[PDB]
């Protein structure tokens, strides 16, 4: 059994949002709902228990309520560090049988914009000696967390061999991503340059490396 | 201040049995919750201080939890593991309590008063009226939930992957800054952690002494079925060649630790 939550909710800085948690008389109706905050990269964090009681360290702007078989978590004065998946939970016809909600993703809009910092690494000598070649394009310190990466061999696009990660948050609330171009050492050395193009909010940053560039 | 530490395998083959351990330090019930990637939390089971165990009714036949007070552990057994069971397994402590209907202190259950006088909210009668029914002594039961449960402490979690593929330790390669790749007074240098399985890999820099601008990127799953990631740190450009920079790659699934020195790009 699973409690019903909205898939996601969003709000701008300083705004208010609420997440609902719908169940039945045997769980939510019992009147002892709990809420949990899961920030990707950290362990889950208990936020509310007993419908309305805040865990230690949770500020007042995190409020819990309930009307019948639907509990609600209200988050006011939204801050960037609130972004996380929020889950409700409750006992189900028993104080030891627990049920969780489907989870709700929180996005906080209106954070400071920032262009991407791009670093392109060519294949290392060690990787070449192992008969493989990987160009590594690291992308950091950008907001919003949306970018598109394109690669060039000389001046022409490269489609095959590209793997890119979906952006994720750094420790400073900005986003980072990485892209890889896999080559054989032969074709790394058979062309005069390779480039990584990162596009962010209509503007593009391009870095280039050359096999002839040692040091 | 309770601390919970999960231990067990990082990789299972299909239909294998998963045995996990949780070591409790400091000082209810101790139990297990899991979360498959991109999916919701799922309570598994728990054991209380009296030895009673309870299990997710949908999974009970597959689960088994035991405890040892002398070792301050609990265990978890999960039979018939499949790819559906790949998940992060969290050890938890939970507050539990069933409240029967009780009268407030200085009140006693007396069904005669509402039965015979029809008073409302009067299941309980104040003791000061010595068994007699006075409307100014009425009271409901203690207002409280019948069932109390919530997770009071969360472990850090153990990632368990179910796959037919076998463990593989990582190959670590340097991402050395070039003379053209610097950023003035600072520069980015990192390590490429290649071709490992399963997740996770953690990366520190200089045994944790270097934390400024450190970021470990999410892993990419290559068509080979092996993972790769990169870790980068920002460094003083004047220190390239003078200070030693080492990325400490830890791959618990293979009991492997690699300390790779990242030296300045050279024209040997």
Numbering used by the authors:
A (entry chain L): 2 to 9, 11 to 27, 27A, 27B, 28 to 95, 95A, 95B, 96 to 106, ...
B (entry chain H): 1 to 27, 32 to 82, 82A, 82B, 82C, 83 to 269
Give verbatim excerpts from the published study on this entry.
Here, by x-ray crystallography, cryo–electron microscopy, and site-directed mutagenesis, we structurally and functionally elucidate the mode of binding of a potent bnAb (NC-Cow1) elicited in cows by immunization with the HIV envelope (Env) trimer BG505 SOSIP. The exceptionally long (60 residues) third complementarity-determining region of the heavy chain (CDR H3) of NC-Cow1 forms a mini domain (knob) on an extended stalk that navigates through the dense glycan shield on Env to target a small footprint on the gp120 CD4 receptor binding site with no contact of the other CDRs to the rest of the Env trimer. The HIV-1 envelope (Env) protein is a heavily glycosylated trimer consisting of heterodimeric gp120 and gp41. The most broadly neutralizing bnAb isolated from these sera, NC-Cow1, had 72% neutralization breadth on a 117-virus panel, with a half-maximal inhibitory concentration (IC50) of 0.028 μg/ml.
Crystal structures for Fab NC-Cow1 were determined alone (2.1 Å) and in complex with the BG505 SOSIP. As in other bovine Fabs, the ultralong CDR H3 folds into an extended β-ribbon stalk supporting the disulfide-bonded knob domain. The knob domain begins with a conserved CPED motif (CPDG in the germline) containing a type I β-turn around PEDY, followed by three very short, antiparallel β strands (D6-D8, D23-D25, and D37-D38) with two intervening loops of 14 and 11 residues. Loop 1 forms a single turn of helix, while loop 2 has two small helical turns. The knob has three disulfide bonds with 1-4, 2-5, and 3-6 connectivity (D2-D23, D12-D32, and D21-D37). The knob distal tip also contains several Tyr and Arg residues. The knob distal end extends about 35 to 40 Å from the tips of the other CDR loops. Superposition of the Fabs or even of the CDR H3 stalks does not necessarily superimpose the knob domains, as the knobs can adopt different dispositions with respect to the stalk and Fab core.
